[PDB]
Symmetry: D2
Subunit: 431 residues, 4 copies
């Protein structure tokens, strides 16, 4: 039973609490799209852990590579090169759009954004960084100063030169022109302001192609191109954070591919490691060259460590081989439509959005007022659990509770249907 | 041969350069205190990789646990608890001094210091952070603003409220009282200044018990206690960064134990993971409690992930069982004395310092002028390699080149003698 | 002749150049609404110097008081009280709205805003300051960080916690709701953003009732009240900068009176001194009380100096006695209508705005495109001079050249007509 | 009687309290080295007001010029040149050392330092500013961030890039080499630190030749030269703040003349205006030239206003004519020796320092412990008043109470003796 009093005792006694609340169960094993409790109960992992297990839990291929290297090449002096490192660097260079040529292999999302941000500042000689007011880039320093969805308060001043602009949000529009939402005009409006406050040191813009923590907010048609150009005109880099979107999730290997806009620096993480700590940035040769010229510095313990590298490599190998990127679209379509039928039944569902297998469901009270569903979310979330479905709802100012849905690219047709089933039951029972 | 033209081609073409220079060899395998090149040549790893492989490369016990969990419990939704997590948290609570009760499990050194620093600011409501002018805490935001050994230039303003004080350096003293080096008076002097510049927002002091990147600088007798008290009087936390010192390396499980001063927050990393990415902070229940009360937030992808946790646990298990902490003193003594004999032979060696198996050798031209050996270091470093010994020299302003020596706690008597041998040959041949 | 080669030689040789260009004439004397050159030519001062000579140049009453005190009470140790100081403080308390009770007498506009801003931060314990993107508050530190009309570039980082919002600009509207300019919605929109970037330290909002340097931008009906409330809800002070508007200029003794919204802190300057350096802030007793409790500090050489105080007093005496505030409306109306007739004749005039005797004329190319008149301004400005009328045009991003018009409250009907005359001639000749 | 209940009532009711405490008297008139109360009692102004009345109160020559211009040329549009402006600019260029060629005429000390600091940052392209930990430069923004004697707390973050070094203080030395105070070594020590914290953006060093508010601290022999060189090597400007020292006070027209080191920018104020608000900066033609090239901006209401300019001119005229600079040395010597005799009598006097007519007397309990006299100061200060002598004591951390003594350069032999008399009586009566 999950009830083990010693477990919970030691948990209460020795764990630092870092946000939210611990699920009152003890997880003992994980396989495929399922995690299992101490009673053996099976929970459908509709969030891929913390949106990382792209190939699911304990993917035989992953297992082998991990053991294959665990005992052969493990961790090395940061000045030593090895095969997995170089092969991954190359692979990344070969699968990302043209213009992205060089990679640095790290360990975490924030770490990746930090390295990117640092290189941007170096290269440009400037330091002001603009982001979305609903962004999420990490808990560390620079990453955190660019994160506006949460954590800004009670911890002192942000980094000098930090600005934000509103993100384009089609569901709840706020900027109009000739009776319509003109998300571009909004962009122009926003940048004018930026311009008026800048000190003449704009160095980069950092953005997620899809605002995950922000509520599964997809940047609408033409935006990125527009953005890009806004940067171009001001001598700024465009850093795209693809932690949740990279690696096939949204139906393309990378989200920037859909839009057809390649960034100056692209960051990867969660999905690249498939649950293990691997991260990376990829940039153009020129930028790397100038960064070098100027003595760029991003020296760590785990930069260029074989084990992870090796793992990142397998994962790409399999996504490609098993054609998971396509799959994403296919199961994505399946889940999407299923989500729409629920919306057909219940009025508490106000929006179904996302792309591929990165989907969001916005709970609302009045499907015409689009009034946030107060607590209803927690309830549903809660019944999903009782029911055996792991979910995650995000709640932000002025929006309704959002269910972030993101199963494994390896998810099965049956599991999809199964989640959809439990989701409906939880809903009806939650009302 | 390490000469593989495709390897090097792809290395030149796709790797981002993050600091220093890549060793012109290809590493293919690692076992114990050795890493092997593409020709099979064996290199004695006298730096434990990037000072992490505490149990050496591919430690059978580590291997098993990694595989044992790789296929059983891998990565989880950050809200889910598991056994390895809770057991490690407990273990840490049980082996660290009294006053250290709760832990948060992360992935990297900088990440750990960031979480610590963030909690400090939260809890106190202040934001100014003091560190040593020769410090090294990480490449990310807050970690980097407190790092003064390198990387301050060309990347924009540091974090608001950043101060530094000189570290006590017995070899090259600079503060005198009644014809003698009074490192405490220096401390008092230093803090007065701080006090005069603070805005009334001092929140913490962050320090390494032994300045590794700073040149293997050990804080002298009574200092830490003094420091601690300096903080106490100003309502500041004392955060001890034990990334290179924690886990038995300096002869004690933790360096703060020797001095008999327990910090408000203690950070661990490199050594805890033994080459894998595991990190953590440990603090008092009260501080955790208040941090909670105020909504502390340090939510990441890999916080509380079973695999690493599991790995951290084994490592403690083995250090304890195999009595490596003691061993540290014993082989440490061996290596130390060996280092002294070389100093007896060559005049280029000006100091032999450190503790346990964290030793430094300061190369100097005039052993009376204590004039830095210009380039001589690089040479020796270079011959050690040709000879089959991996080394690392650090070079800072106003000091001589420093060889950071830190082999595995699992190192053998013979390997020690072997390194000492090659080290002498490299030296004599370098002159 | 203004041609004096020694004059100009020494001018070129020893003057630091601080902005714009020196008028190629030498001024020898000033009386009423006129300044005279070296040839004796009379120039109508339609800008009241640098918008200060409210009673005109060398106002007999001013002259006497200056001499009356120059030889009786001059400058004192900042701890010594005197009559003029206390009488002025009282007068200000008696003529400003209720809620404004205590005054601090300074020397300059920026100085006044700085003291206000400092007190705000003290009292609230916060430090973030919001202003208009078209604001002007001074060249010194805090004053300058809140100034967004000019000077942000090439001089390093602004003050930490500096934000700006767009000012309501009826002529060139940019925010729409149901096909209309909803300046309030704009306000709400703007503050949401602020809110998302604040670190939880908003302390005050600083605003000019009429954006003078920003292009004579008047805050539209209901705005201030709205603003005020936006602050109220966030525990922020509202600091109103009345340097150009205070002292009768816009038809009321103070501009905040019209709107019927009294600020937490009100600043005065230019007009209060009538060309001499006198400045002041006025606040509520409570705020003063708490500021005191906390040890507010604003100690200077000229704080509470009799001469200026004395001068400030006379000026109030006369504005009141001669009923200049009313007059303002009357001549204001006269000038306004005259400005409209010109607009009736020429297409280059796109807007006539302002209040009282603080008027702006926006030059535009297409009176339907509202396309800025490129250079045309400089030309007109230039012919006004040749013609004997001193003017000032301000040029900002995205707007047309703006003529700031502000004659003395003592201006005569004939002078008004005279300026209007020359203004037309300059225009027609400029085309 | 000073007792006027209405006066005090309105004082309590409408005055903002800005620091310290208001003298319980009402000043009605001021002439020469005396200010008079409401009872007619005469108070010897041993502080020249707030150290400004260099020619004393109501100096006939000053009076005339003020009236002479009050009615002829008063305040002008900042773009208009006039004779007094240009003549003063020239005069300053002619009386300051070589290398100082151009001037900008302002209104206040802080204002002057701000303009200087701003120009420094512009010209260099950097923003970090170093000052003394016992400095005083003004209450406004940048001026205040460089002020470390007081006001750093409770008002939010200082300006980004703010550093301080300890000032050389011969009386209470703290840095030793071969058993002696090596103020230069201290300098070297200090800058090393700075260097380690800078981000590579050091732009200027701002210093008072004599730390007035800091306790009358004179920079010892060779220091300034050393300082200068420290700057030179780092591409930094040296800005000398001569608000209390400029204009003959310390025995030279400017204090930088004694040392024989001319700064890159020199600021003047208090003394230049002789109680009226006039201020200025003086710099080299090159610096002005580059500042211009880059669009330096320091546009205010009172920049280049005739009245004050005119006043500044007379003052120079008289200092020169009446040979007050010499006088300074002569009466200075007189007062100095007189101060020494008191020290001969009382043990509470621990130091007599200063230069010319800018003298300090440090009160101490144990003339061997050099233990600060707790409150004794206030007492003496208090009896001086009862006795008819206005004084000022400054009290800083770790030092004894300091009497800042600075009478008018026009002071008489008898007044000097008179102050010395009362000072002794106050002392003996205070014990
Ligand atoms: C776009 C993006 N970038 C970086 C990160 C954080 O990376 P690390 O937390 O592993 O350092 C997230 C976070 N993911 C969390 C856990 C915050 C989530 O909300 O799912 C992210 O969304
Ligand atoms: C005390 C201390 N704390 C944190 C870190 C960095 O942790 P990560 O680089 O893994 O984020 C080091 C660095 N170690 C490096 C690689 C910089 C080294 O110099 O050995 C460190 O010394
Ligand atoms: C609202 C407001 N507040 C303060 C000030 C500046 O005061 P000081 O320049 O006298 O320090 C102005 C400026 N007036 C100038 C000269 C900038 C102008 O544009 O007319 C101002 O407009
Ligand atoms: C060196 C120096 N520089 C600037 C200033 C301030 O100028 P303002 O206060 O007139 O703006 C002082 C201050 N004088 C005060 C009143 C603070 C004093 O302590 O005497 C100063 O000492
Ligand atoms: K490594
Ligand atoms: K996790
Ligand atoms: K005064
Ligand atoms: K002027
Ligand atoms: Na590519
Ligand atoms: Na413990
Ligand atoms: Na009132
Ligand atoms: Na000169």
């Amino acid at each position: 039973l999950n009830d083990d009093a010693t477990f919970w005792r030691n948990a209460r006694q020795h764990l630092v609490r870092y946000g939210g609340t611990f699920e009152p169960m003890i997880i003992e094993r994980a396989k495929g799209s399922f995690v299992y409790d101490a009673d053996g109960r099976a929970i459908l992992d509709f969030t891929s852990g913390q949106m990382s297990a792209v190939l699911g839990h304990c993917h035989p291929e992953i297992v082998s590579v991990i053991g294959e290297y665990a005992g052969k090449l493990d961790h090395l002096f940061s000045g030593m090169l090895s095969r997995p490192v170089v092969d991954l660097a190359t692979r990344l260079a070969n699968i990302t759009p043209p213009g992205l040529d060089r990679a640095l292999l790290l360990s975490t999302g924030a770490e990746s954004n930090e390295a990117a941000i640092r290189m941007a500042k170096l290269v440009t000689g400037k330091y002001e960084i603009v982001g979305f007011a609903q962004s999420w880039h990490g808990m560390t320093g620079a990453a955190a100063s660019a994160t506006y969805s949460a954590g800004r308060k009670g911890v002192g001043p942000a980094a000098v030169g930090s600005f934000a602009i509103p993100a384009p949000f089609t569901y709840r529009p706020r900027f109009e022109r000739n009776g319509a939402y003109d998300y571009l005009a909004e962009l122009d409006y926003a940048f004018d302001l930026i311009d008026r406050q800048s000190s003449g040191n704009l160095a980069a813009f950092i953005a997620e192609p899809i605002l995950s923590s922000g509520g599964i907010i997809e940047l609408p048609d033409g935006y990125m191109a527009a953005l890009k150009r806004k940067c171009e005109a001001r001598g700024m880099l465009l850093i795209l954070d693809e932690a949740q979107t990279g690696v096939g999730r949204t139906g393309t290997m990378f989200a920037c591919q859909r839009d057809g806009v390649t960034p100056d620096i692209l960051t990867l993480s969660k999905t690249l490691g498939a649950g293990l700590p691997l991260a990376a940035i990829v940039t153009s040769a020129a930028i790397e060259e100038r960064a070098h010229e100027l003595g760029y510095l991003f020296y760590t313990t785990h930069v260029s460590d074989p084990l992870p590298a090796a793992v990142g490599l397998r994962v790409l190998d399999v996504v490609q081989r098993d054609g998971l990127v396509a799959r994403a679209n296919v199961m994505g379509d399946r889940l999407r439509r299923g989500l729409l039928d629920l919306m057909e039944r219940f009025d508490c569902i106000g929006d179904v959005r996302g792309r591929g297998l990165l989907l969001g469901v916005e709970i609302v009270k009045d499907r015409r007022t689009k009034e946030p569903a107060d607590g209803l979310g927690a309830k549903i979330t809660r019944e999903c659990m009782n029911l055996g479905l792991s979910m995650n709802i995000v709640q932000l100012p002025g929006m309704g509770g959002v269910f972030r849905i993101a199963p494994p690219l390896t998810v099965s047709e049956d599991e999809i249907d199964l989640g959809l089933s439990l989701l409906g039951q939880a809903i009806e029972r939650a009302l």
